[PDB]
Design a protein around this ligand. Structure first.
Ligand SMILES: Nc1ncnc2c1ncn2[C@@H]1O[C@H](COP(=O)(O)OP(=O)(O)OP(=O)(O)O)[C@@H](O)[C@H]1O
Ligand SMILES: Nc1ncnc2c1ncn2[C@@H]1O[C@H](COP(=O)(O)OP(=O)(O)OP(=O)(O)O)[C@@H](O)[C@H]1O
Ligand SMILES: [Mg+2]
Ligand SMILES: [Mg+2]
Lengths: 514, 502
């Protein structure tokens, strides 16, 4: 049985409403037309016509190809009669499954001399940070690059010991654009907004997995749950469901006891048996297993291991090292496996040449402030002084920007504690050179800005929407943070005086002639 | 009301599930009795919450999966399969443009949303015989109802089926290729199946699509709106089901609220058109209205810049496309401009202050070819003529990048290329001549852009790749010279010919 919707539009006064019509398999136009004449009281002496909404007339030849399930049909005196009264033609407009499969394909663009693949990994780290935010003890977040072909096909796995997901929460995860606002306890403010409350849009994890690869296997277990819940979303399963005319967004969660990998029969996915065996220890976990990894991603992760782990340490510097930075707990552990090589392992806390560590440890002093923007948003700011010592500047180098800072921007920008990589602020009026402090001192300052969600970011969290615009608005008030207290100030003069004091206390102009 | 029951008492229990039809008026004991009868403990949800008559109605709903177990916390001997639906949330549409148009390089990004709708009209009018009329009407006169933004073209329009397709997020031309032309001004700008929906839901909260093909006697009208999605959700109706209204041209009887008064004057004009599409955005955010009202000359120049080469052709502003903008305010004269009238958009300034040009192609391994042009702006007696750029308030170009970048003929606003090696100062030509050159790069779709079409994905990285071959185009033939010395020579000639001291 397939339903069609018939509008009688022979005369203006014809019934406004449509008449639905159940049509069984292997029926013909003559049968269809007879029923119409009978129910509606129409002599088979009327020369009326039946047309689609495009005015294509139904005939015996085209009946089966034209009268499909769901179509709307017109009863007309003639094929091109004037539509005296308006019709309502039912439609379905379900999003195409590429809403998921292509959600990350054209989002992570390259900018400022950076490879964006680690930003997809950061999206998954963000999820694990939120999931581990109330852990008693260690918050463990592992990224395993299973690129050893003696264990199966390449796979990227992100595993944490967070709170995990129920069947329902795992169902929610699969819903594109289902966020914490739609499916929530807004956290109490905290310095640098290191609150682990990084989610906003309900899409980031899906963009990441389908950017990295073509199939995601979610494995999760809350502490309360006896059972492990497992859900696969993949390009292959959508294509299969399309070809077989099955519901595109229907599937099933596999519930199972911990450590049971009997459902893994693909030898390509061998490595999953060992991942699933590891579940016995864990009271609560989530594992994101990505397969169908694009070859260009694998080659970058193999050949630039020190660079892209550094990028991640840079992004999560203040989550790793706390609000003061790495003045030289969360364990973010990367491990990569290749045929013929010892496992490569690094805890991001080990990394010492990420840009923030260099800024923090080459700084002689700092200048701390807040910016109060119209709309009640508050930005935390820090400026750091990197002094000239005898014969050299100490402002650290940045490989993306091959006398001290140069033409580089002063400020890196952080949102809920993590770096937003493609938004920098060059300077403000009050920290550019006009004077009361020597000009070259304005080139010795680096900085960081910290917001919470009051300042919007783009969906991919690569950029702020309008951070600089709001900070430089005429109504924005700047305050100084000193000894824990916040106070209004005359910032142009008070920053200059701070800069002059830094020059006199820290800059050293003594050198043996060459 | 169907539930799916898994018998999981023993390791040998039946693997498959047994669907049970639980009537609407049924009890826990009744249900329990039906279970004992059908198969031969406790019953739980998939979270091991035990079914009781206290929770029976809040727990045994249509479509749920249930467990038959010896105890609540018995280990699962055999794995179950729990049916789920995961339809995208309707914010997949309503919020599709809310966090996509970020500000960069001092530009307000609102006109980029209008460019997305212009791109659609360029493609819809690509085979028009005669004029291609693309109108943007800002109906901000409150005597005619609430604010609205309308984009109206005289293109091919949409059938009922094509209008249905337009409402499918991510339904593209690939899941439903012109011949190469200069600067890829091919009007084949679509790719992703989302741009138009991001634009309307960035600008406002409701989109009325009105369309009519020439081969169609009826007009097709479809509304997508935040308010409609919210009503369907409240009433538990299918989220992605609606209807297309089909009507005769110029019939506006369905418009009954005074706040949409303006639509009568808009629909009356359908008499005059064989084919058309009208996008009508309502629920316009107040901040978009304020910007559009107070910076008319700025944001219309932005659109002329973006579409310079579609307006003026492949040589620039030294065609049958009429992009007309009109804004209506209470007690004011209509503001009206054809983008072809604008003369101080950046590309016009580059084209007209240029004394000579240097043309070239970049061949990127993988069949991708980029067309490029560099323009020389001389020093005339006592000033540089390199045009100023309000986004950027070495005396000529200064720190600005050389190259603006175009994709299928239209500007990509947030992708610039500062320079290449062969056109950066080393001296076969005075150093300061290298600061007097602007340029533009043109690609087709062989070079990827992001979904919102604000940036290229990896244009600069591929252009600077060591395998990339740079060839000059002189007259109409490809010359095989070493571009770097060829360009330094061209820059000497330009200096010795166009720079003036007296
Ligand atoms: N590692 C995890 N542990 C527990 N729950 C998770 C994990 N990853 C994802 N989820 C759940 O799935 C949901 C969807 O995640 P996704 O990253 O797609 O969107 P989001 O994080 O909510 O928003 P955003 O788009 O800002 O990332 C999350 O809100 C979270 O509840
Ligand atoms: N003004 C118009 N006239 C005729 N058809 C249109 C018009 N606007 C949109 N369409 C149809 O609706 C479809 C969806 O448009 P939308 O802009 O959402 O995606 P797209 O243009 O296909 O891809 P992209 O995301 O690259 O813009 C278009 O492909 C086109 O077929
Ligand atoms: Mg997320
Ligand atoms: Mg489009």
């Amino acid at each position: 049985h397939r339903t069609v919707y018939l509008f009688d539009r022979r005369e203006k006064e014809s019934e406004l409403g449509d008449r639905p019509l159940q049509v069984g398999e292997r029926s013909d136009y003559a049968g269809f037309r007879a029923c119409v004449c009978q129910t509606l009281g129409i002599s088979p002496e009327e020369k009326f016509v039946i047309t689609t909404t495009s005015r294509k007339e139904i005939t015996c030849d085209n009946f089966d190809e034209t009268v499909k399930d769901g179509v709307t049909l017109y009863l007309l005196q003639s094929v091109n009669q004037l539509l005296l009264t308006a019709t309502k033609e039912r439609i379905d407009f379900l999003p195409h499954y590429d809403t998921l499969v292509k959600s990350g394909m054209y989002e992570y663009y390259a900018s400022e001399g950076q490879n964006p693949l680690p930003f997809a990994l950061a999206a998954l780290i963000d999820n694990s940070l939120s999931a581990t935010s109330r852990n008693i003890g260690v918050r463990r977040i592992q990224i395993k690059l299973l690129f050893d072909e003696t264990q199966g096909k390449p796979a990227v796995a992100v595993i944490d010991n967070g709170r995990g997901m129920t069947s329902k929460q795992l169902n929610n995860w699969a819903v594109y654009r289902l966020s914490k606002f739609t499916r929530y306890v807004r956290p109490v403010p905290v310095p640098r907004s290191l609150n682990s409350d990084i989610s906003y849009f309900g899409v980031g994890g899906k963009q990441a997995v389908f950017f990295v690869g073509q199939s995601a296997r979610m494995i999760s277990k809350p502490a309360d749950s006896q059972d492990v819940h497992e859900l696969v979303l993949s390009k292959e399963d959508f294509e299969k469901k399309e070809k077989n005319k099955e519901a595109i967004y229907s599937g099933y969660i596999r519930n199972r006891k911990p450590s049971d990998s009997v459902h893994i029969t693909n030898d390509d996915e061998r490595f999953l048996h060992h991942l699933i065996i590891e579940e016995k220890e864990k009271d609560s976990f989530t594992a994101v297993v990505i397969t169908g990894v694009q070859p260009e991603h694998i080659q970058y992760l193999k050949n630039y291991f020190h660079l892209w782990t550094r990028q991640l340490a840079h992004i999560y510097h203040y989550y790793i090292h706390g609000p003061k930075g790495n003045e030289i707990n969360i364990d973010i552990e990367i491990s990569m496996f290749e045929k013929g090589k010892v496992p490569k392992i690094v805890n991001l806390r080990e990394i010492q040449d990420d840009m923030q560590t260099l800024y923090v440890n080459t700084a002689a002093d700092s200048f701390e402030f807040k910016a109060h923007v119209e709309g009640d948003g508050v930005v935390e700011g820090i400026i750091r002084y990197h002094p000239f010592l005898y014969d050299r500047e100490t402002y650290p180098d940045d490989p993306c920007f091959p006398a001290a800072r140069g033409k580089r921007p002063i400020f890196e920008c952080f949102w809920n504690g993590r770096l937003i990589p493609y938004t920098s602020v060059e300077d403000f009026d009050w920290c550019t050179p006009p004077g009361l402090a020597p000009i070259e001192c304005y080139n010795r300052i680096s900085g960081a800005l910290f917001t919470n969600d009051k300042f919007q970011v783009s969906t991919n969290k690569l950029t702020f929407m309008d951070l600089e615009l709001k900070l430089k608005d005429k109504n924005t008030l700047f305050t100084r943070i000193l000894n824990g207290q916040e106070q209004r100030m005359k910032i142009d003069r008070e920053f200059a005086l701070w800069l002059k004091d830094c020059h006199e206390k820290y800059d050293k102009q003594i050198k043996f002639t060459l």
